[PDB]
Amino acid sequence: GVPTYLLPGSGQFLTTDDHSSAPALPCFNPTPEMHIPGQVRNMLEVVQVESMMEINNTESAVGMERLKVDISALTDVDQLLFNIPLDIQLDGPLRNTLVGNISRYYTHWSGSLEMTFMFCGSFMAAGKLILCYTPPGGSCPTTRETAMLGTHIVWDFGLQSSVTLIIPWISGSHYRMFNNDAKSTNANVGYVTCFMQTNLIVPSESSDTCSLIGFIAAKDDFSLRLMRDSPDIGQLDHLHAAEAAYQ
Amino acid sequence: GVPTYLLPGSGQFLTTDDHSSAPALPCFNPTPEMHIPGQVRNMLEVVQVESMMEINNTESAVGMERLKVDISALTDVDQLLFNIPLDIQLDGPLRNTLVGNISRYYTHWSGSLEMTFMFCGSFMAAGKLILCYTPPGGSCPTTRETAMLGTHIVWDFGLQSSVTLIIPWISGSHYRMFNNDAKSTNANVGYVTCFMQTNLIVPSESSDTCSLIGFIAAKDDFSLRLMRDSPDIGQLDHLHAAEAAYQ
Amino acid sequence: QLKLGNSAIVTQNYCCAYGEWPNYLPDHEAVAIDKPTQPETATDRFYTLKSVKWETGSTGWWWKLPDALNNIGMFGQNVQHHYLYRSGFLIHVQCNATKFHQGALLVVAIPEHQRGAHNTNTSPGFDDIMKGEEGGTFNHPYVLDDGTSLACATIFPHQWINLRTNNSATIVLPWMNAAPMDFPLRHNQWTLAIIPVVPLGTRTTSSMVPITVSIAPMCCEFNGLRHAIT
Amino acid sequence: NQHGVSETLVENFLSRAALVSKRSFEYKDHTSSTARADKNFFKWTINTRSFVQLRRKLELFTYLRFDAEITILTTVAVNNTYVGLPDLTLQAMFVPTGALTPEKQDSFHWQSGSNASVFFKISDPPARITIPFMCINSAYSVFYDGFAGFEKNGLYGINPADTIGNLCVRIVNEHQPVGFTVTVRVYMKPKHIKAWAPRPPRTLPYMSIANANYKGKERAPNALSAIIGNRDSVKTMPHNIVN
Amino acid sequence: NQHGVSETLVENFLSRAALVSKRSFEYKDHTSSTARADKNFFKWTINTRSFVQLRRKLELFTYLRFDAEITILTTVAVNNTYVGLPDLTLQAMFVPTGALTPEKQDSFHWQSGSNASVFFKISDPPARITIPFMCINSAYSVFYDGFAGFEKNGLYGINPADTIGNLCVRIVNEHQPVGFTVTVRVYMKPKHIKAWAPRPPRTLPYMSIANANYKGKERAPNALSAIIGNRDSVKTMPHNIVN
């Protein structure tokens, strides 16, 4: 007949192959495809939707107090409000985001991020902030004089109650790494800080402890590759009633 | 289905095969090819670059004294300065060269060699040498009267501080052998000798012990085949921290 | 002349490293979305290092780029303020003596010179590699301090200063990295290596013969502008 | 944009042959074993809910339309002395949801007059069958906000239309004078995936397979009151570059 | 020129399936073995640095762009009496650089929800997978003159972008009443090689895999002060034809 010979890799079961197999149910007519709303053809569509950062990932922030950042009226000039580690692959405020949990299924990642800070004070509350993205190499800038030299945006609380802080894609390589190292030149992203540009100035009837909801999305140039398991979920023993699927 | 039968050589793992295999990462987009300087498409490009001979491969030549050859003023007529065994496959002055270490990955070799002797005396230092390539069969010619009959070149130290001693490809066969035998008719190349054509004549202020740096390259007609392991490097036990790649 | 910026060198033969002349980063190979700033004359100029004494018992000298130039001039100020970095170099190593001196200098520019320490299995630390403007002296230049060979070191981009023949070496380096730009404070893409293959010898009155190294960072790009690290 | 987006495709994201079932069942004289122990066969109601890697990937979406590609890796071990591993022939009969699953190893339900059986061996490559899209609806309800029955005793979140069926796997050989621990690992690769309505990725650990209950870790990360692990203050950088 | 130059091609020079990993790990009841001993699995950080034949061939170049073709040859031996060699099923799960490697043989990381596992046997032909070009840069930095981190504690010469990943290989079977010494030889053939910036071939022997340290042989050849073996004088021919 046809003279063949088995290559190495014969009889192996690669879990990521793309071969057809013998169908168990022949001449089975599947259910006709009905138009269901919101088809995801590509997981970047899940990533490019903005989702809340837990910038207030501290102790004594129980439950829902972790999403918002309580800014207040400050009697001193140019105080730091918050800073955000930008590793979407590692644990931090970006881990429980759509750009974070989907990227932890991957190892390499490119493309720009898109922060959005939604201010949730009163209409009478007026003030200005700065949103300083600092490219890495140095420490986190603790003064506003240090952080203004990086990529920043000055944001009034006029009718503007939201922003678009484009964290630009600044890297030597085309992608990044995970490699358990947040301080590596191949994995570290930089630091977004936020300072009082002026102050949070409220009247006598508005609440002084106003909150910032911080979002993060990804831009159109975002990319992910080298798919891996998620470290977010784990399994020590079998789940409950998993034996009951055998009974 | 398709009636087949397994040939002999089925399930073998030949290390030098050219078969495609099932990729572990499907739809993986690699990093785009950036123009990096100096691509080697062919290992003869590494070979055709001139590299220093260790003609002074003697004892009491410690370290860097082995590259250069200290020639001096001689009171006697027509003395031998140095001679070079020309086996690029075997151990000798040509082993630690680009034409040597890359050829020791191979067994057969064709093509002409290209020696270059760079003189490193003073500008006031004047003299003449001869560079006698002798085809094999006889002994190494010890007198200049014997070595002038072979392929030679007479070289002034005028503005000429370098040469191009084309060792021509003279062989019966198309290629050569290694076969652990430097004296075989299939492996021996011949002998390059160097005699004082006149003398090394320096003034009272130039250093009399002038040096010759000897290079060797390969020509365009050089060739290598029948690839083998390199005998230059070896391994008795595992290297240090090689177990640490498993921990 | 080698006129770069306000700096210039009059000369009376160079070596494009791997045939490539250093240019700016092309847009199809660009990775960062913002425009890289190009200090076209403040940094594209000859920065001259400290001259080292080419003596009789000398083993060698190595300067890692841009680590030799991370604290010099406006190039040192663009490096410390910007995260990314991309430039080629025009190294002009120049060493002249009389017509009675002899010697040879393998002025060789090594791409990615991962060094090694003798007799120990511990990797070289940060202080053994990032020497800065002072550079370093070769411990074993016969094996280039990495187990390789100096005899084959001419496969690298380098020429010669034979005091018989010439008195200068010009090596013109492109950007040599797998990445288009790189963080310059933790990586050294090139390494200018200067090795006494034939030592300095003469019978005349022994003058000091130094080797002066002028390095001109050509086609400097920079991204990631922020506060200085220094 | 030179960077390819082709690995984030859901056709590449979900089509990984992940583990969906694993039973190490004994293989011996089952004349003294109890009713709980597997008497040389096991039923398995085919679900993606048992192993949390494929579950959380499929719980990213509300509705899924995939063809399962069931690959059955059967491996064997010996329960003092050791002898050679046998070349056991196995039958993996596909039983629909709620149909008659067999009571014995040698019962007359394994004759498979219409049920799709696959007969494979341990020494062979693993048996791979393509289960097609077998839902009465146009997509698998991964999350079914509702109840199965018309009475008020139905199970919440469990649509039986979402269930593929039963993968009844037995060993075709008779019992042998020594016992073997035959482990059957089932690997399902969803293919031709059409995924609708993406969802938040589940942060808290799973409690059961029948429902979306949650307890969380006792402390952060992935705790109930604190999903992301805690730091000192909001102005304190965890992985700061301090030189 | 009639002589072909096609064997000195780097596509032919480097594409040899050379040995890159080898562990003879035990296979038995690991209820009394220590933490250092392999409890039926091993992790391996994939590198070309461990075996000096492929290492010196890839250390001829500064930058390399190849697709690895990992071929895993698993062979088995028995630790008094002798019995037949088992047909052990092995899993070789590909873990990225710095991801979660499994702690046990039967841990729930081997389910491979997204990690590329290959399931092969000893009796089968060796499992061959093509690892693509997996660097964030456009080429593998074989020599990385620099440091990994932004702090001054990083390892010199080790770029983690150069690292392929982890090749976590376990035995899918349970423990058996006799012990086996299961040796797993991994053979990597780089293919589609694009090689940049050639380097001097390393003369001195290697000391470690993490760095380019050197000691040399005590005497010539390949010594520190003398790479080429010594002769009598510069005018003395070693292999002279004396008739």
Side-chain angles (χ1 to χ4, degrees):
Chain A
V2 177
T4 63
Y5 63 96
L6 297 176
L7 294 177
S10 178
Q12 71 181 1
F13 172 60
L14 184 62
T15 63
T16 65
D17 55 354
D18 196 73
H19 298 96
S20 67
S21 64
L25 296 178
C27 297
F28 185 82
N29 295 113
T31 307
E33 293 182 354
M34 190 183 74
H35 185 273
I36 301 169
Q39 186 176 2
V40 174
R41 280 80 178 269
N42 192 356
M43 291 301 293
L44 296 178
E45 301 180 357
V46 183
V47 174
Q48 293 176 0
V49 173
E50 61 184 2
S51 62
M52 287 184 281
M53 300 183 284
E54 299 187 358
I55 308 165
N56 196 0
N57 53 0
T58 66
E59 291 181 354
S60 70
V62 174
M64 297 184 65
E65 298 178 356
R66 300 172 66 87
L67 296 173
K68 65 181 178 65
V69 179
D70 289 329
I71 64 171
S72 297
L74 294 170
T75 63
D76 289 330
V77 170
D78 296 336
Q79 296 300 109
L80 178 58
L81 293 178
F82 58 91
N83 54 7
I84 299 166
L86 288 176
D87 292 329
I88 65 171
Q89 297 292 322
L90 279 84
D91 196 1
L94 302 183
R95 183 181 67 83
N96 193 8
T97 54
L98 293 169
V99 73
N101 291 115
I102 306 301
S103 297
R104 291 169 71 90
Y105 289 102
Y106 293 91
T107 304
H108 297 176
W109 63 275
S110 177
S112 298
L113 298 175
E114 188 267 329
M115 282 184 177
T116 298
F117 290 97
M118 181 176 174
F119 183 72
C120 296
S122 69
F123 185 77
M124 295 293 110
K128 287 174 186 287
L129 301 183
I130 198 167
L131 294 170
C132 299
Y133 169 67
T134 300
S139 65
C140 180
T142 61
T143 62
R144 196 187 71 189
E145 295 177 353
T146 305
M148 54 174 273
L149 301 176
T151 299
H152 64 88
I153 188 167
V154 175
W155 170 48
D156 194 3
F157 307 129
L159 191 144
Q160 295 291 319
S161 65
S162 295
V163 286
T164 301
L165 178 60
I166 302 298
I167 295 170
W169 177 244
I170 296 170
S171 179
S173 298
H174 289 81
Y175 291 93
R176 297 296 177 88
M177 293 292 289
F178 176 73
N179 65 18
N180 283 319
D181 195 1
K183 296 182 181 179
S184 177
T185 59
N186 294 317
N188 196 0
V189 191
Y191 306 114
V192 171
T193 61
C194 182
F195 294 88
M196 283 292 177
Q197 187 73 28
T198 65
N199 198 1
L200 181 65
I201 300 167
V202 296
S204 298
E205 295 177 354
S206 295
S207 180
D208 54 352
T209 308
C210 297
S211 297
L212 287 169
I213 295 172
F215 298 95
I216 185 165
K219 297 296 294 298
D220 55 352
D221 58 355
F222 193 79
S223 177
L224 288 164
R225 70 178 188 176
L226 210 164
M227 190 173 179
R228 65 175 180 175
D229 58 350
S230 179
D232 293 332
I233 199 67
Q235 191 173 2
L236 294 174
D237 290 329
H238 294 286
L239 299 176
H240 180 73
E243 186 178 1
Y246 297 102
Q247 299 295 321
Chain B
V2 177
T4 63
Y5 62 96
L6 297 175
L7 294 177
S10 178
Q12 71 181 1
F13 172 60
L14 184 61
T15 63
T16 65
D17 55 354
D18 196 73
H19 298 96
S20 67
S21 64
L25 296 178
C27 297
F28 185 82
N29 295 113
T31 307
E33 293 182 354
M34 190 182 74
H35 185 273
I36 301 169
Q39 186 176 2
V40 174
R41 280 80 178 269
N42 192 356
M43 291 301 293
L44 296 178
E45 301 180 357
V46 183
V47 174
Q48 293 176 0
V49 173
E50 61 184 2
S51 62
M52 287 184 281
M53 300 183 284
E54 299 187 358
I55 308 165
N56 196 359
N57 53 0
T58 66
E59 291 181 354
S60 70
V62 174
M64 297 184 65
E65 298 178 356
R66 300 172 66 87
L67 296 173
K68 65 181 178 65
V69 179
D70 289 329
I71 64 171
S72 297
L74 294 170
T75 63
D76 289 330
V77 170
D78 296 336
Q79 296 300 109
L80 178 58
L81 293 178
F82 58 91
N83 54 7
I84 299 166
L86 288 176
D87 292 329
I88 65 171
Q89 297 292 322
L90 279 84
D91 196 1
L94 302 183
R95 183 181 67 83
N96 193 8
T97 54
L98 293 169
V99 73
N101 291 115
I102 306 301
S103 297
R104 291 169 71 90
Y105 289 102
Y106 293 91
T107 304
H108 297 176
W109 63 275
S110 177
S112 298
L113 298 175
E114 188 267 329
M115 282 184 177
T116 298
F117 290 97
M118 181 176 174
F119 183 72
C120 296
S122 69
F123 185 77
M124 295 293 110
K128 288 174 186 287
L129 301 183
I130 198 167
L131 294 170
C132 299
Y133 169 67
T134 300
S139 65
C140 180
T142 61
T143 62
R144 196 187 71 189
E145 295 177 353
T146 305
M148 54 174 273
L149 301 176
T151 299
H152 64 88
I153 188 167
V154 175
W155 170 48
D156 194 3
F157 307 129
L159 191 144
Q160 295 291 319
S161 65
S162 295
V163 286
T164 301
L165 178 60
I166 302 298
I167 295 170
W169 177 244
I170 296 170
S171 179
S173 298
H174 289 81
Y175 291 93
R176 297 296 177 88
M177 293 292 289
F178 176 73
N179 65 18
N180 283 319
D181 195 1
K183 296 182 181 179
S184 177
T185 59
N186 294 317
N188 196 0
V189 191
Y191 306 114
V192 171
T193 61
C194 182
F195 294 88
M196 283 292 177
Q197 187 73 28
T198 65
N199 198 1
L200 181 65
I201 300 167
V202 296
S204 298
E205 295 177 354
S206 295
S207 180
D208 54 352
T209 308
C210 297
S211 297
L212 287 169
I213 295 172
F215 298 95
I216 185 165
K219 297 296 294 298
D220 56 352
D221 58 354
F222 193 79
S223 177
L224 288 164
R225 70 178 188 176
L226 210 164
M227 190 173 179
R228 65 175 180 175
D229 58 350
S230 179
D232 293 332
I233 199 67
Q235 191 173 2
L236 294 174
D237 290 329
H238 294 286
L239 299 176
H240 180 73
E243 186 178 1
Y246 297 102
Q247 299 295 321
Chain C
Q1 293 183 357
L2 291 172
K3 185 178 184 293
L4 273 76
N6 54 2
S7 66
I9 294 171
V10 295
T11 185
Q12 292 180 354
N13 194 3
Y14 60 94
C15 179
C16 284
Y18 299 110
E20 294 291 327
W21 188 260
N23 53 1
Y24 292 103
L25 184 62
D27 290 330
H28 66 278
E29 295 179 355
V31 171
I33 62 166
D34 53 352
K35 185 179 185 294
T37 184
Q38 294 174 356
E40 295 179 355
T41 57
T43 64
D44 303 338
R45 65 178 300 279
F46 283 93
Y47 295 107
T48 301
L49 298 177
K50 180 64 71 178
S51 300
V52 289
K53 292 180 183 178
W54 165 252
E55 295 178 354
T56 63
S58 296
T59 59
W61 293 276
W62 57 268
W63 290 272
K64 289 185 181 294
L65 294 177
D67 178 66
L69 301 175
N70 286 328
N71 209 166
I72 294 172
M74 284 301 293
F75 184 75
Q77 299 298 321
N78 282 113
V79 160
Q80 290 174 356
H81 291 87
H82 294 88
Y83 169 64
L84 290 178
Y85 166 69
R86 183 184 188 273
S87 76
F89 295 99
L90 197 151
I91 300 171
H92 184 76
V93 170
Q94 46 189 352
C95 176
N96 48 2
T98 63
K99 297 184 185 293
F100 294 96
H101 289 88
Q102 70 184 358
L105 286 149
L106 183 56
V107 178
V108 58
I110 299 170
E112 294 290 332
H113 190 66
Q114 181 181 359
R115 294 179 61 85
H118 180 267
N119 205 5
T120 186
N121 50 4
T122 303
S123 296
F126 187 80
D127 291 331
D128 292 332
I129 302 300
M130 304 296 283
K131 295 289 186 181
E133 190 268 330
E134 295 178 354
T137 301
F138 280 102
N139 291 318
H140 299 94
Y142 174 68
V143 296
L144 286 175
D145 287 332
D146 56 354
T148 62
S149 63
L150 185 68
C152 302
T154 63
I155 194 67
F156 283 154
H158 78 330
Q159 30 196 102
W160 290 87
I161 298 172
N162 196 2
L163 299 176
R164 176 63 184 267
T165 301
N166 54 0
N167 54 0
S168 67
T170 298
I171 300 172
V172 181
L173 302 177
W175 177 252
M176 195 69 210
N177 197 359
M181 301 183 78
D182 201 359
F183 181 66
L185 296 177
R186 294 293 184 271
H187 187 75
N188 298 321
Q189 295 87 18
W190 290 99
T191 299
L192 177 70
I194 287 172
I195 301 99
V197 183
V198 175
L200 182 66
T202 189
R203 289 181 180 175
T204 187
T205 59
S206 296
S207 295
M208 181 188 75
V209 178
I211 299 168
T212 310
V213 174
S214 297
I215 300 169
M218 296 186 71
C219 296
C220 296
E221 293 187 357
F222 292 100
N223 282 115
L225 178 64
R226 84 292 201 204
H227 66 281
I229 300 171
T230 198
Chain D
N1 195 3
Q2 290 179 354
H3 290 171
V5 300
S6 66
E7 190 164 356
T8 63
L9 294 177
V10 183
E11 185 67 28
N12 196 14
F13 188 81
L14 294 177
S15 66
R16 297 287 188 269
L19 185 65
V20 290
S21 176
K22 182 257 184 67
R23 291 192 72 87
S24 298
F25 67 98
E26 295 291 327
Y27 173 70
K28 64 182 181 68
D29 292 332
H30 292 287
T31 62
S32 66
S33 65
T34 62
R36 183 177 291 172
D38 290 329
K39 294 181 179 180
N40 297 323
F41 71 101
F42 66 96
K43 186 263 290 179
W44 174 55
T45 300
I46 295 173
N47 53 3
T48 73
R49 299 286 185 266
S50 296
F51 288 96
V52 304
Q53 286 303 117
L54 187 60
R55 184 177 180 180
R56 187 178 183 270
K57 288 171 69 177
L58 300 185
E59 287 185 354
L60 295 182
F61 298 103
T62 302
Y63 295 111
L64 293 172
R65 183 184 175 94
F66 57 89
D67 292 331
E69 190 171 3
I70 294 295
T71 298
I72 300 166
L73 179 70
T74 295
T75 203
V76 66
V78 178
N79 291 319
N80 289 317
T81 62
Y82 178 77
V83 287
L85 293 176
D87 192 1
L88 294 173
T89 304
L90 278 82
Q91 179 179 2
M93 180 172 71
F94 181 71
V95 175
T97 305
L100 291 175
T101 63
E103 294 179 353
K104 294 180 181 180
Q105 179 188 2
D106 55 352
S107 69
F108 290 93
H109 293 89
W110 295 103
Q111 52 190 346
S112 296
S114 304
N115 289 319
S117 294
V118 52
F119 289 91
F120 63 98
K121 295 182 175 67
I122 296 175
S123 68
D124 286 332
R128 184 185 286 172
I129 56 171
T130 298
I131 284 175
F133 178 72
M134 278 170 54
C135 187
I136 59 176
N137 298 318
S138 297
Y140 293 108
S141 295
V142 181
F143 289 89
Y144 184 78
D145 192 2
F147 292 90
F150 289 107
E151 291 183 353
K152 295 178 177 65
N153 55 1
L155 296 172
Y156 180 67
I158 300 169
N159 193 3
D162 181 73
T163 301
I164 305 296
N166 292 319
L167 189 64
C168 295
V169 179
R170 64 99 174 261
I171 296 171
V172 180
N173 294 105
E174 293 183 354
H175 61 87
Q176 290 179 356
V178 297
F180 297 101
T181 304
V182 175
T183 303
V184 176
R185 287 173 174 85
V186 179
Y187 292 93
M188 187 189 78
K189 185 171 77 175
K191 67 179 184 179
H192 298 285
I193 306 102
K194 296 175 72 68
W196 292 275
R199 295 181 67 91
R202 184 183 176 95
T203 62
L204 296 182
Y206 291 94
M207 292 183 72
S208 178
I209 70 164
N211 48 15
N213 286 326
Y214 60 94
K215 183 176 174 66
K217 192 179 177 181
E218 292 178 352
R219 292 181 182 177
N222 286 317
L224 176 67
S225 66
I227 289 168
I228 289 169
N230 291 319
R231 61 181 175 177
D232 291 331
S233 67
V234 296
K235 60 181 71 65
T236 297
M237 186 59 64
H239 297 287
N240 198 2
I241 306 298
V242 178
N243 287 317
Chain E
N1 195 3
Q2 290 179 354
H3 290 171
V5 300
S6 66
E7 190 164 356
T8 63
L9 294 177
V10 183
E11 185 67 28
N12 196 14
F13 188 81
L14 294 177
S15 66
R16 297 287 188 269
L19 185 65
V20 290
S21 176
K22 182 257 184 67
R23 291 192 72 87
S24 298
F25 67 98
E26 295 291 327
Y27 173 70
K28 64 182 181 68
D29 292 332
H30 292 287
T31 62
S32 66
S33 65
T34 62
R36 183 177 291 172
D38 290 329
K39 294 181 179 180
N40 297 323
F41 71 101
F42 66 96
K43 186 263 290 179
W44 174 55
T45 300
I46 295 173
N47 53 3
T48 73
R49 299 286 185 266
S50 296
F51 288 96
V52 304
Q53 286 303 117
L54 187 60
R55 184 177 180 180
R56 187 178 183 270
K57 288 171 69 177
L58 300 185
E59 287 185 354
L60 295 182
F61 298 103
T62 302
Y63 295 111
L64 293 172
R65 183 184 175 94
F66 57 89
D67 292 331
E69 190 171 3
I70 294 295
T71 298
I72 300 166
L73 179 70
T74 295
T75 203
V76 66
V78 178
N79 291 319
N80 289 317
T81 62
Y82 178 77
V83 287
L85 293 176
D87 192 1
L88 294 173
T89 304
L90 278 82
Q91 179 179 2
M93 180 172 71
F94 181 71
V95 175
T97 305
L100 291 175
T101 63
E103 294 179 353
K104 294 180 181 180
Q105 179 188 2
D106 55 352
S107 69
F108 290 93
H109 293 89
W110 296 103
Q111 52 190 346
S112 296
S114 304
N115 289 319
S117 294
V118 53
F119 289 91
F120 63 97
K121 295 182 175 67
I122 296 175
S123 68
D124 286 332
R128 184 185 286 172
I129 56 171
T130 298
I131 284 175
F133 178 72
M134 278 170 54
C135 187
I136 59 176
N137 298 318
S138 297
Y140 293 108
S141 295
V142 181
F143 289 89
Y144 184 78
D145 192 2
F147 292 90
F150 289 108
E151 291 183 353
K152 295 178 177 65
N153 55 1
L155 296 172
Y156 180 67
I158 300 169
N159 193 3
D162 181 73
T163 301
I164 305 296
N166 292 319
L167 189 64
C168 295
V169 179
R170 64 99 174 261
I171 296 171
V172 180
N173 294 105
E174 293 183 354
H175 61 87
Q176 290 179 356
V178 297
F180 297 101
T181 304
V182 175
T183 303
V184 176
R185 287 173 174 85
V186 179
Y187 292 93
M188 187 189 78
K189 185 171 77 175
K191 67 179 184 179
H192 298 285
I193 306 102
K194 296 175 72 68
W196 292 275
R199 295 181 67 91
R202 184 183 176 95
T203 62
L204 296 182
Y206 291 94
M207 292 183 72
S208 178
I209 70 164
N211 48 15
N213 286 326
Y214 60 94
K215 183 176 174 66
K217 192 179 177 181
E218 292 178 352
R219 292 181 182 177
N222 286 317
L224 176 67
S225 66
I227 289 168
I228 289 169
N230 291 319
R231 61 181 175 177
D232 291 331
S233 67
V234 296
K235 60 181 71 65
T236 297
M237 186 59 64
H239 297 287
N240 198 2
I241 306 298
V242 178
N243 287 317

